[PDB]
Amino acid sequence: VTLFVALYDYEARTEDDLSFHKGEKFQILNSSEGDWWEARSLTTGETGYIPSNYVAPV
């Protein structure tokens, strides 16, 4: 079990990062690389890389 929510919003300025607002659920699949992990949008379904400091455990 590893569900993290976005504590803040973010506008993906690239085709790699993602876009969402506080309250959006995210599935952190890999969080070992730099400070950016790859989460999967449970709503849209597209995966991307978001700031790890912008998400926290349920």
Partner: peptide, 14 residues
């Protein structure tokens, strides 16, 4: 390079 990391909204401002 060093991940940018959008600094949260200042020190919890507003």
């Amino acid at each position: 390079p060093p991940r940018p990391l959008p600094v949260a909204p200042g020190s919890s401002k507003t």
